Enzyme design. Structure first.
Site, PDB file in Angstrom:
ATOM      1  N   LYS A   1     -54.514 -74.566  -5.106  1.00 14.91           N
ATOM      2  CA  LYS A   1     -53.650 -73.777  -4.240  1.00 14.91           C
ATOM      3  C   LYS A   1     -52.225 -74.301  -4.165  1.00 14.91           C
ATOM      4  O   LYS A   1     -51.444 -73.802  -3.352  1.00 14.91           O
ATOM      5  CB  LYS A   1     -54.238 -73.702  -2.832  1.00 14.91           C
TER       6      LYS A   1
ATOM      7  N   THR B   1     -58.652 -71.218   4.803  1.00 15.27           N
ATOM      8  CA  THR B   1     -57.869 -72.157   4.015  1.00 15.27           C
ATOM      9  C   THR B   1     -56.929 -72.946   4.914  1.00 15.27           C
ATOM     10  O   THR B   1     -56.699 -72.568   6.055  1.00 15.27           O
ATOM     11  CB  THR B   1     -57.066 -71.435   2.924  1.00 15.27           C
TER      12      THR B   1
ATOM     13  N   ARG C   1     -61.563 -75.060  -1.264  1.00 16.91           N
ATOM     14  CA  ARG C   1     -62.656 -74.100  -1.186  1.00 16.91           C
ATOM     15  C   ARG C   1     -62.134 -72.672  -1.241  1.00 16.91           C
ATOM     16  O   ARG C   1     -61.130 -72.344  -0.606  1.00 16.91           O
ATOM     17  CB  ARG C   1     -63.454 -74.290   0.103  1.00 16.91           C
TER      18      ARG C   1
ATOM     19  N   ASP D   1     -63.251 -75.975  10.743  1.00 19.38           N
ATOM     20  CA  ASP D   1     -63.197 -74.565  10.386  1.00 19.38           C
ATOM     21  C   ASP D   1     -64.206 -74.256   9.289  1.00 19.38           C
ATOM     22  O   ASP D   1     -64.417 -75.054   8.370  1.00 19.38           O
ATOM     23  CB  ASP D   1     -61.800 -74.161   9.924  1.00 19.38           C
TER      24      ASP D   1
ATOM     25  N   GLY E   1     -53.918 -66.570   1.900  1.00 16.01           N
ATOM     26  CA  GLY E   1     -54.121 -65.139   1.988  1.00 16.01           C
ATOM     27  C   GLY E   1     -54.902 -64.616   0.804  1.00 16.01           C
ATOM     28  O   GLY E   1     -55.828 -65.281   0.334  1.00 16.01           O
TER      29      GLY E   1
ATOM     30  N   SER F   1     -56.356 -70.369   7.645  1.00 10.62           N
ATOM     31  CA  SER F   1     -57.309 -70.143   8.727  1.00 10.62           C
ATOM     32  C   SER F   1     -57.370 -71.339   9.667  1.00 10.62           C
ATOM     33  O   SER F   1     -57.405 -71.173  10.890  1.00 10.62           O
ATOM     34  CB  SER F   1     -58.694 -69.844   8.159  1.00 10.62           C
TER      35      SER F   1
ATOM     36  N   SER G   1     -62.836 -73.475   5.447  1.00 10.51           N
ATOM     37  CA  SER G   1     -62.188 -74.565   4.737  1.00 10.51           C
ATOM     38  C   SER G   1     -63.224 -75.620   4.384  1.00 10.51           C
ATOM     39  O   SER G   1     -64.210 -75.797   5.100  1.00 10.51           O
ATOM     40  CB  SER G   1     -61.094 -75.193   5.593  1.00 10.51           C
TER      41      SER G   1
ATOM     42  N   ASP H   1     -56.541 -77.736   0.747  1.00 15.81           N
ATOM     43  CA  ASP H   1     -57.956 -77.921   0.446  1.00 15.81           C
ATOM     44  C   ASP H   1     -58.308 -77.219  -0.870  1.00 15.81           C
ATOM     45  O   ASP H   1     -57.429 -76.785  -1.618  1.00 15.81           O
ATOM     46  CB  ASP H   1     -58.822 -77.417   1.594  1.00 15.81           C
TER      47      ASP H   1
END
Lengths: 219, 204, 245, 227, 229, 234, 237, 196, 201
Positions: free
Chosen positions: A33, A1, A19, A166, A47, A129, A169, A17
């Site tokens: 989020k 994330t 996902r 990444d 997390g 991440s 994400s 984001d």
């Protein structure tokens, strides 16, 4: 994330984001989020998803009670205090990492909170991440006292770099702009990716499936 | 793993003014079959269902506690439950046992009792709601079902095409899973009727 | 402090428990409630004490289960607590056995709670009396009655509340054992209520009637609408006008 | 109204005085101590011929070498008897030896004043303990106030005054157990209202070298033959 | 603490402390509640003993949530405790069901709390009576709760000093077709009857509940309405 | 009238009546005398019997190898206090491995006894105590009251008709510090005899003696063992 | 918690709450019990009989176990608690010892429970009295009686409730060896003893019978009418 | 390891269990009974860990008998099975777990015969025939092969004999004798032991 | 350790050895392994000595209290049940004990086996300890229910001697007990070093 936040001359810009994965398989493609905490305070969580959800809901209810009793708009320092104290009480078993932000009678404020109860007060923050890929963009292109549109473009670039570099994400970009006179909640802001068009026609015609038993229950 | 001790597969799909929920029929202990007609889909209202997959003891315990709470709620309030409220209730019930969790992952499917607008959603082990618009899967054969549904699902499905789609997806997905299968049960929830069907599947 | 203690849970020189008689005296002022048992169902009829014109399921009939209903007389504040406890007892039984509770078990479980308050604790008892109606696979349609002291007993036709003695005498006169249907039971209830109320003639706004019946393998608990009570009252009036001739 | 723990102006607890008053309504028990053993004799108040006399037990076995006779409110003595039995068994478990009569009496009488506002009032039962230990036959008396003493001959109950007055002249240090039994039976006959007939009395003895023993009908008939 | 009940039955079956609490309530300041087709209006009198008092320091009309509001008649200190508990209960319901609490559920929970103080050890009943207004499912609500723990649903009600005349006034001048502004006019007129002195925007308090939520009127709006009347 | 049923009620004159009634409880017990010299401490007790067939009640108890007590009043309260004292002495010897000083034990007794005289629904200990001990500072005689107040004495008598013994002791204080053990014992016996009615006399049956000293553990003499002390009296 | 002392001593050493519990018991409906040779019989008189009431719900003879049963007199709600305590104790005993209870054991348990309520803080005594009948493993019939104060005794025949003294006077004369030689005679004796108090004949009598290896049996009104008619025919002598 | 089998026919339930109590490498007892009677028409067969079996079974028996004595009527087989499952599931996650495998056989005057299966994780299933042990593997295939819903009592006993002879031939453990019982509308009947 | 007990027409017979070791070192050879609970009950010890002694003392005191309260003696089944329930609460702690309980009551002779794992089984022939597998052979070949008293004594002695011959942690002397209807008696205590010449020749 990937969650990011920046402070400009008039307020805060937060971005994330959409996902959500479970292992190495994409579970949700339109997760949310950015969480409501107060009409002037918002939070972005990373997390474990359940822990961030419950933590933000509890803190939001407590601030609602406090603001009802006092009769005033709440402060970002209060929410930061309760969050950090609750997180430290649990000795790090709540895997929530939070980017908190808001505007009050003192001005724009932006905090970052870690799972063990730490806290930083900073002019720009990233977590997740893909936190390093966005921090590269902030280190390259940040100036103090930007305008609204420049800050929005900067946050979009950071989140896009996190998405494209990444594996954890992806999908869309969400933005939230907090100012002294308004609050914008863009959902979605950008759609960098689209699903390809199907070439064949796999429609199953009626009568393709064999049935053993059947019953009808008229309501 | 603990989620694979008993096996199981459940899925929900959304059409136009209707929903479909399907589950497999098998109870076994690892690699040995015990029974076939095991119940995994429970009704929580006139047009509302929940499906449990995972560990059988936790499946039954969660179903019974949820019915307890739902009955008390409906007696106090005097009305029928809403799908949002049921999802929040299940999330609360699952999060209360954090650090000691029940080993199940529910799937909820129903219609709004006031407007008859479809609702499907799924929760994880410790209760994180995840509301979709197309389809939700749960069980040991989730990858196969994702693959089948990404290719077969299309918007605005009438009850017949929805039934055919969900039947084909479930059959072809559980044909590739060793510890799931041996019968498929399908419920089609519609405005004015509910249709229950049992499909012809391989028994090996 | 011994000075201010009122000594609720003690005997009297005659062997009586004064707080319980005072609670029962309190109950004898509430609205009349009546219960009748028939061959194919059971019914409850209650008097509405709320008659102000500015007032806005039912007022005094509560649903405890899929198969049971109850009505209270006395102090409504305690009735709410007792009803909320009955619902929880029924749900606990269903959770443990995966079957609905029988009626007598529920009545016993509440009466235990009622007696515990009268024997110890230093607190005052509950000033309410209840009528229970239900269906049970062991015994069928059943009707029960409770007291503040924790005493219950089954009946075939009973009345609690204001002017209970006259209603009981009328029931003894008119009730026929083994030959009652829902229609005759409704007529008898209307007649007794009309002869008990302190009004020249009965009105549809002052009464509420609930019927428990068993159709198609399921229990139905139905509260009668006003336009049915109006027709019942008109039928009773016509029959009374043609009764003497 | 007053509490359970108030002193009187002349320094006595009211509740203990009332319990001691209640003691004087029970049946008469008489115990005699000799160098050959100890004997306990008690009444029975049969209120109807439809009652079974054998269901009335006022002489119980605390242990194989210790017996007890009680009077007053009979239903209250059960707790004391239960505790006495439990303490004797605990002493045997820990030390592998038999308890002393004095130690049993202390353990029982330590519960006398343990009440307040758990027990809510004193016991109102009076006890006579008879036992044989390393020191020989011993007779102890314990009352609701928590005081216990050692005696040579004691009488408790409703007719305690006349029975004690008679025991004053009867008793002497060289009595034989048989003479003690006869004397106790004579005093009981004097103080009773009904006629002593080997059914409305109860008698037991403890002697060195043998356990606690309860007299049966035949022995009672044989002994009462002389009276 | 005392573990015995201070409220007990009288030889005629009456609970007397409850009657005394109602006597305390009947000596408080008037309150009026009116339910219309578009929302609910609550009005109360706020006369104060001196000019040195700050008129805006404390309020009688208070919000429980975004869609529920309270007024009271009786003792202020008890009203504050009840308000605190009602807010906590609404927050607990929201935390569980992720949905705002309906009015009829809040009234039940508050009534149970008020009843607990009638059958508990070493405490006295509350000396306040409450009027609750809310908006749910596209329609308004109006409830009253008593020191005993019994609640009722009303259309128009008055409470406090001279409440029988207020009830007669409401009965003679109420119909189900009122708009919210006609309701406000009727409520202010009902407060005008049996008022002492000349009333301004500083010695009355008004609150309204409709589709947008619950809000207490500002003194400028009260001035406008008083000028209109 | 209404100020005498509870221990937490002050009389308008600033007195607590329940404490005074507990005092009255002590003055109905049999007499007890305690006195000391430069080297020894002695307790003399007069015992009572309900009848000629009953043994005389005990009045001298063992508390520790250097501490003994004598009782007047309620017996069960005396047993409670004696067990508390024994436990305190055992705890001191366990932790520090030396005998507990007598004054520090009396302070503990007073601290324990004061608490009941302040709370609702509790009663004072209706027992009075005479404590004889010996430690590094020599002999000690202490006297304790139900009101949690304690006194340190040269000689003291408690119980019924104990004023006569107090007068005798006040007359003869001067010789105590120089007397040896036998003379001290005879002085105590004379003081105790001053309380008896003119028709009664001291005997081996109703007299108990307890002695503690520099090189002598607390010993109790009863029955025939008190015959040597009675010999030569008068 | 409420820790007040309810029952305490009075001058002359009486316990007034226990006496008032005795007074409460002396107002209940009469219960008579008789111990025969191979049969035990219990009988209760119905204080009030109405045609609108179900009898099954107001029975005053309960079964504590397969071999022990009891009848009571006093306050019904207290008995409903004591009975459910005794049932649990019987099951616990059977589980732990692997043997059905003795009549003395269960009556001792009930007496101890009733006595412990006259010496605790914040409680009032039980206002009930009990007759307990049964058969032991060796085949001996047993009759016991328990008091609100906590005392229990064994009896040959007994009566409790209101008018118990008159029934005891009748039993003192009419209980003999020849009157209990067969079940019919014992049942007739119980019915005749009850008839000294009850009104309107046998319409107000509940009768229960137990035998050596059979469970409790409630006698129907027709058998009661037959026995009453036979007793009436015996008056023609 | 112990062996339990149950077969459910049109108007009866047939159950069987072995009679060995073994400790280490030696047989301690050869007439052990593993069949507890909860009622006049309910049997509960239990195997598993030592100690837990008897404690759990006796607790269930006490509670069922207490229900009978309080209420005047007996629990149905379904309610007893649900009660047992709830009591095992509650203890699963506590500090005192029970390691027991259960079969419950009963007859109801309205719903007919019933046979229930429960493993040590407290999952309850209803089956027409069931087995516990290591012999379940060797026996369930024969039962699948030769069972019909209309089977009669004599045919059921013959099928049980086939299964036990298969255990004699193939299985490595010495199980000489089995106890057999049947439940019907007339109660519980003890049949002749099958021995080899 | 080896202890055996068998039941026949004239009552119960119990036999035990006497050696106790701590590792490979023989601590003593005069241990008394038949614990005398009452004048009418017998118990044995195997496994931990402290656990057996402690819990059987607790059982003896419970039996005495029961007899005092109920005016009747406890039975063998009830005593075994009490012992089984007192050790199930320490399951997993680390106790180690296995005991026969022997007596005579209203239902005849009684012989129960209770161990710390949880087993409680009635029987007609038991053997526990390290060398029990050596006593099963001889006892099974020789046991019959119609034995005479002397024949049963001889069988028990021979079984214990054969067990100690091939087991290394078993030895010492053979202690024998006989449970009859009017209480138990102590028959003999025979040294193995003399049974050797008696049997071999």
């Amino acid at each position: 994330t990937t969650i990011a936040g920046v402070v400009y001359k008039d307020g805060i810009v937060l971005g994330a984001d959409t996902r959500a994965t479970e292992g190495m398989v994409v579970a949700d493609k339109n997760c949310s989020k950015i969480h409501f905490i107060s009409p002037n305070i918002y939070c972005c969580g990373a997390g474990t998803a359940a822990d961030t959800d419950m933590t933000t809901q509890l803190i939001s209810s407590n601030l609602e009670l406090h603001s009802l009793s006092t009769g005033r708009l709440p402060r970002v320092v209060t929410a930061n205090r309760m969050l950090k104290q609750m997180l430290f009480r649990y000795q790090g078993y709540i895997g929530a990492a939070l980017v908190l932000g808001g505007v009050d009678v003192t001005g724009p404020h932006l905090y970052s909170i870690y799972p063990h109860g730490s806290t930083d007060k900073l002019p720009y923050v990233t977590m997740g991440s893909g936190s390093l890929a966005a921090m590269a963009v902030f280190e390259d292109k940040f100036r103090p006292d930007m305008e609204e549109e420049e800050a929005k473009n900067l946050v979009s670039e950071a989140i896009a770099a996190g998405i494209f570099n990444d594996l954890g994400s992806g999908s869309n970009i969400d933005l939230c702009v907090i100012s002294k006179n308004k609050l914008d909640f863009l959902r979605p802001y950008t759609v960098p990716n689209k699903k390809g068009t199907r070439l064949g026609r796999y429609r199953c015609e009626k009568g393709t499936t064999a049935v053993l038993t059947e019953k009808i229950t008229p309501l | 793993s603990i989620m694979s001790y008993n096996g199981g597969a459940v899925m929900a799909m959304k059409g136009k003014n209707c929903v479909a929920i399907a589950a497999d029929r098998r109870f076994g202990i690892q690699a040995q079959m015990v029974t076939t007609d095991f119940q995994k889909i429970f009704p929580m209202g006139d047009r509302l269902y929940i499906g449990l997959a995972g560990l059988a003891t936790d499946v039954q315990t969660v179903a019974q506690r949820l019915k307890f709470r739902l009955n008390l709620y409906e007696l106090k309030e005097g009305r029928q439950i809403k799908p949002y409220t049921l999802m929040s209730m299940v999330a609360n019930l699952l999060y209360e046992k954090r650090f000691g969790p029940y080993y199940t992952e529910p799937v909820i499917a129903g219609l709004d009792p006031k407007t008859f607008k479809p609702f499907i959603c799924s929760l994880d082990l410790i209760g994180c709601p995840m509301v979709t618009d197309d389809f939700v899967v749960s069980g040991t054969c989730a990858e196969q079902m994702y693959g089948m549904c990404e290719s077969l699902w299309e918007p605005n499905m009438d009850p017949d095409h929805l039934f055919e789609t969900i039947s084909q997806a479930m059959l072809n997905a559980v044909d590739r899973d060793a510890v799931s299968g041996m019968g498929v049960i399908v419920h089609i929830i519609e405005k004015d009727k509910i249709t229950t069907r049992t499909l012809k599947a391989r028994m090996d | 402090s011994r000075r201010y203690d009122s000594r609720t849970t003690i005997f009297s020189p005659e062997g009586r428990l004064y707080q319980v008689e005072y609670a029962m005296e309190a109950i004898g002022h509430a609205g009349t409630c009546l219960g009748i048992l028939a061959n194919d169902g059971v019914l409850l009829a209650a008097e509405r004490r709320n008659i102000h014109k500015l007032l806005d399921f039912s007022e005094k009939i509560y649903k405890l289960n899929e198969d049971m209903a109850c009505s209270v007389a006395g102090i409504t504040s305690d009735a709410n607590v007792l009803t909320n406890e009955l619902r929880l007892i029924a749900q606990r039984y269903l959770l443990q056995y995966q079957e609905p509770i029988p009626c007598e078990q529920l009545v016993t479980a509440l009466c235990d709670i009622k007696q515990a308050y009268t024997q110890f604790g230093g607190k005052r008892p509950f000033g309410v009396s209840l009528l229970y109606i239900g269906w049970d696979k062991h015994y069928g349609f059943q009707l029960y009655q409770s007291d503040p002291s924790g005493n219950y007993g089954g009946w075939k036709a009973t009345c609690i509340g204001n002017n209970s003695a006259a209603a009981v005498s009328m029931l003894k006169q008119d009730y026929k054992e083994g030959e009652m249907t829902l229609k005759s039971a409704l007529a008898l209830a209307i007649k007794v209520l009309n002869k008990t109320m302190d009004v020249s003639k009965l009105s549809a706004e002052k009464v509420e009637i609930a019927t428990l019946t068993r159709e198609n393998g399921k229990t139905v608990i139905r509260v009668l609408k006003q336009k049915e009570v109006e027709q019942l009252i008109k039928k009773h009036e016509e029959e009374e006008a043609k009764a003497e001739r | 109204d007053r509490g359970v723990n108030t002193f009187s102006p002349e320094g006595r607890l009211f509740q203990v005085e009332y319990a001691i008053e209640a003691i004087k309504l029970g049946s008469t028990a008489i115990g005699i101590q000799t160098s050959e053993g100890v004997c306990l004799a008690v009444e029975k108040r049969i209120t109807s011929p439809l009652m079974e006399p054998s269901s009335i037990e006022k002489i119980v076995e605390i242990d194989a070498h210790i017996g007890c006779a009680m009077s007053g409110l009979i239903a209250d003595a059960k707790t004391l008897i239960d505790k006495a039995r439990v303490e004797t068994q605990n002493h045997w478990f820990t030390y592998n030896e038999t308890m002393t009569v004095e130690s049993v009496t202390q353990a029982v009488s330590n519960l006398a004043l343990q009440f307040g506002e758990a027990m809510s009032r004193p016991f109102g039962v009076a006890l006579l303990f008879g036992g044989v230990d390393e020191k020989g036959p011993q007779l102890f008396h314990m009352d609701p106030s928590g005081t216990f003493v050692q005696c040579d001959a004691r009488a408790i109950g409703s007719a305690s005054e006349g029975a004690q007055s008679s025991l004053q002249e009867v008793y002497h240090k060289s009595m034989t157990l048989k003479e003690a039994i006869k004397s106790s039976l004579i005093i009981l006959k004097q103080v009773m209202e009904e006629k002593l007939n080997a059914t409305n009395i109860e008698l037991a003895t403890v002697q060195p070298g043998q356990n606690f023993h309860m007299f049966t009908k035949e022995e009672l008939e044989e002994v009462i033959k002389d009276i | 603490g005392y573990s015995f009940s201070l409220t007990t039955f009288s030889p005629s079956g009456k609970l007397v402390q409850i009657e005394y609490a109602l006597a305390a309530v009947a000596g408080g300041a008037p309150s009026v509640g009116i339910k219309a087709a578009n929302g609910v209006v609550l009005a109360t009198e706020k006369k104060q003993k001196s000019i040195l008092y700050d008129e805006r320091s404390v309020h009688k009309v208070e919000p429980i949530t975004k869609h529920i509001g309270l007024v009271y008649s009786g003792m202020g200190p008890d009203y504050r405790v009840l308000v605190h508990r009602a807010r906590k209960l609404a927050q607990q319901y929201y935390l569980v069901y992720q949905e705002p609490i309906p009015t009829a559920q809040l009234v039940q929970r508050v009534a149970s709390v008020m009843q607990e103080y009638t059958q508990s050890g070493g405490v006295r009943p509350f000396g306040v009576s409450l009027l609750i207004c809310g908006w749910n499912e596209g329609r308004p609500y109006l409830f009253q709760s008593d020191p005993s723990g019994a609640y009722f649903a009303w259309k128009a009600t008055a409470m406090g000093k001279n409440y029988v005349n207020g009830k007669t006034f409401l009965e003679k001048r109420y119909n189900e077709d009122l708009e919210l502004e006609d309701a406000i006019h009727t409520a202010i007129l009902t407060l005008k009857e049996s008022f002492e002195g000349q009333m301004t925007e500083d010695n009355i308090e008004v609150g309204i509940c409709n589709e947008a939520g619950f809000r207490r009127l500002t003194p400028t709006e009260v001035k406008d309405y008083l000028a209109a009347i | 009238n209404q100020y005498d049923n509870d221990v937490t009620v002050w009389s308008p004159q600033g007195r607590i009546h329940q404490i005074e009634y507990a005092m009255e409880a002590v003055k109905q017990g049999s007499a007890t005398v305690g006195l000391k010299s430069k080297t020894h401490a002695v307790l003399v007790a007069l015992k009572r019997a309900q009848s000629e067939l009953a043994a005389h009640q005990k009045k001298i108890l063992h508390v520790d190898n250097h501490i003994g007590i004598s009782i007047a009043g309620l017996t069960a309260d005396a047993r409670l206090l004696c067990n508390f004292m024994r436990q305190e002495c055992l705890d001191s010897r366990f932790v520090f491995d030396r005998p507990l000083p007598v004054s520090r034990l009396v302070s503990l007794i007073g601290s324990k006894t004061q608490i009941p005289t302040q709370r609702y629904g509790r009663r004072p200990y209706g027992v009075g105590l005479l404590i004889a001990g010996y430690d590094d500072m020599g002999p000690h005689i202490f006297q304790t009251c139900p009101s949690a107040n304690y006194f340190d004495c040269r000689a003291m008598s408690i119980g019924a008709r104990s004023q006569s013994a107090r007068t005798y002791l006040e007359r003869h204080m001067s010789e105590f510090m120089e007397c040896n053990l036998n003379e001290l014992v005879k002085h105590g016996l004379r003081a105790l005899r001053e309380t008896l009615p003119a028709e009664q006399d001291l005997t081996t049956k109703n007299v108990s003696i307890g002695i503690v000293g520099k090189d002598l553990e607390f010993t109790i003499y009863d029955d025939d063992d008190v015959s040597p002390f009675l010999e030569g009296l008068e | 918690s409420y820790d007040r002392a309810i029952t305490v001593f009075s001058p002359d050493g009486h316990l007034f709450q226990v006496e008032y519990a005795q007074e409460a018991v002396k107002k209940g409906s009469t219960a008579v019990g008789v111990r025969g040779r191979d049969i035990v019989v219990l009988g209760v008189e119905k204080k009030s009989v109405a045609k609108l009431q179900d009898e099954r719900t107001v029975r005053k003879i309960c079964a504590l176990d397969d071999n022990v049963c009891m009848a009571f007199a006093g306050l019904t709600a207290d008995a409903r608690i004591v009975i459910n305590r005794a049932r649990v104790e019987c099951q616990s005993h059977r589980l732990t010892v692997e043997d059905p209870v003795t009549v003395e054991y269960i009556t001792r348990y009930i007496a101890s429970l009733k006595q412990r309520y006259t010496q605790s803080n914040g409680r009032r005594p039980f206002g009930i009295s009990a007759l307990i009948v049964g058969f032991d493993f060796d085949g001996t019939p047993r009759l016991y009686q328990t008091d609100p104060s906590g005392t229990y005794h064994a009896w040959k025949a007994n009566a409790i409730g209101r008018g118990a003294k008159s029934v005891r006077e009748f039993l003192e004369k009419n209980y003999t060896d020849e009157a209990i030689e067969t079940d019919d005679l014992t049942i007739k004796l119980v019915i005749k003893a009850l008839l000294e108090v009850v009104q309107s004949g046998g319409k107000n009598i509940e009768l229960a019978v137990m035998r050596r290896d059979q469970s409790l049996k409630i006698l129907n009104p027709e058998e009661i009418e037959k026995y009453v008619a036979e007793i009436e025919k015996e008056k023609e002598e | 390891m112990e062996y339990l089998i149950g077969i459910q026919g049109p108007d009866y339930v047939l159950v069987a269990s072995d009679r060995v109590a073994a400790s280490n490498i030696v047989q301690m007892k050869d007439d052990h009974d593993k069949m507890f009677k909860m009622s006049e028409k309910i049997l509960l067969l239990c195997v598993g860990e030592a100690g837990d079996t008897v404690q759990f079974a006796e607790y269930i028996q006490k509670n069922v008998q207490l229900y009978k004595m309080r209420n005047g009527y007996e629990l149905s087989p379904t309610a007893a099975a649900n009660f047992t499952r709830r009591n095992l599931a509650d203890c699963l996650r506590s500090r005192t777990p029970y390691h027991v495998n259960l079969l419950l056989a009963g007859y109801d005057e309205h719903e007919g015969p019933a046979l229930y299966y429960m493993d040590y994780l407290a999952a309850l299933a209803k089956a027409p025939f069931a087995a516990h042990g290591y012999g379940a593997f060797l026996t369930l295939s024969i039962l699948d092969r030769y069972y019909t819903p209309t089977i009669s009592r004599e045919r059921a006993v013959e099928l049980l004999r086939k299964c036990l002879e298969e255990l004699q031939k193939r299985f490595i453990l010495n199980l000489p004798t089995f106890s057999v019982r049947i439940i019907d509308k007339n109660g519980i009947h003890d049949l002749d032991n099958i021995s080899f | 350790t080896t202890t055996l007990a068998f039941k026949f027409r004239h009552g119960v017979i119990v036999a035990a050895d006497s050696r106790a070791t701590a590792g490979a070192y023989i601590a003593s050879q005069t241990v008394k392994k038949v614990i005398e609970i009452n004048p009418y009950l017998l118990g044995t010890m195997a496994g931990g000595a402290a656990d057996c002694s402690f819990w059987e003392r607790l059982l003896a005191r419970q039996c005495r209290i029961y007899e005092l309260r109920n005016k009747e003696r406890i039975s063998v089944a009830a005593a075994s049940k009490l012992l089984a329930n007192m050790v199930y609460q320490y399951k997993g702690m680390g106790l180690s004990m296995g005991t026969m309980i022997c007596g005579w009551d209203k239902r005849g002779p009684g012989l129960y086996y209770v161990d710390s794992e949880g087993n409680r089984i009635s029987g007609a022939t038991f053997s526990v300890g390290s060398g029990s597998v050596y006593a099963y052979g001889v006892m099974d070949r020789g046991y019959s229910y119609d034995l005479e008293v002397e024949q049963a004594y001889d069988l028990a002695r021979r079984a214990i001697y054969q067990a100690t011959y091939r087991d290394a942690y078993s030895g010492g002397a053979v202690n024998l007990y006989h449970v009859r209807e009017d209480g138990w008696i102590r028959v003999s205590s025979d040294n193995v070093a003399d049974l050797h010449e008696k049997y071999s020749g």
